[PDB]
Specification:
Two copies of one chain form a homodimer.
Chain A: E1 8-16, E2 24-31, E3 39-49, E4 55-60, E5 69-73, E6 77-82, E7 84-87, E8 94-102, E9 112-119
Antiparallel strand pairs in A: 1-9, 2-8, 3-7, 3-9, 4-5, 4-8, 5-6
PDB class: viral protein
Keywords: viral capsid protein, viral protein
Assembly: dimeric
């Protein structure tokens, strides 16, 4: 176990949300390979050319106690905001709900996420 | 035991010149505690290519943050740092904006692991 005086944050795990294939879509996505039963926070980041066709995406976890929503929007009024604080399950997984409303969706570029883990205790 | 607080948000002070290097102190933090600051965005693009890059002046801090609001959107990076004994941390901002009439600030979110005396 890591003493609080040696606490560090690992923030180098990044990934992509699978893009939708319809203009309005609700779906889920699993993230996998996490330390089992650890506490994490997932935050949005962006390095992404705007589609300029109003690609709105909201992510949440329907577990009570996974707290927060993440919002993405790429057209003029840029959103890359929110967070979700969650605990990975006993096999190192978590699931998220995505709700997308895109005004165009030919071959959309994924929105992007970063997972942060405090390395302290046995987390 | 371990929970995160991620609701502390703030603004980076905007530049007064087209090309600028300046510092900003974030204050009010728990003295000596360890944090990670990430960029976020909730902001109308200027469309005038407002580029901002941030690094931390504190001893042993690590990372860089980048912002860019025009076509190729950047809201990226992170800095992991320790607040000083006063509850402050100093950052260096490098800005290169193609226009700069009353610019909207770029935005940050500070994450703290609430564990032990952190």
């Amino acid at each position: 176990p890591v003493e609080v005086s040696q606490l560090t944050y690992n923030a180098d795990t990044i990934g992509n949300w699978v893009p939708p294939t319809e203009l309005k879509q609700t779906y889920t996505q699993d993230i996998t390979g996490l330390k089992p039963n650890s506490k994490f926070i997932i935050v949005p980041y962006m390095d992404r050319v705007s589609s300029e066709v109003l690609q709105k995406c909201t992510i949440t976890c329907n577990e009570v106690d996974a707290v927060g929503s993440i919002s993405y929007f790429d057209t003029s009024a840029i959103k890359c905001d929110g967070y979700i604080s969650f605990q990975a399950n006993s096999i190192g997984e978590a699931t998220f709900t995505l709700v997308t409303d895109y005004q165009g969706a030919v071959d959309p570029k994924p929105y992007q996420y970063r997972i942060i883990r405090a390395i302290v205790g046995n987390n």
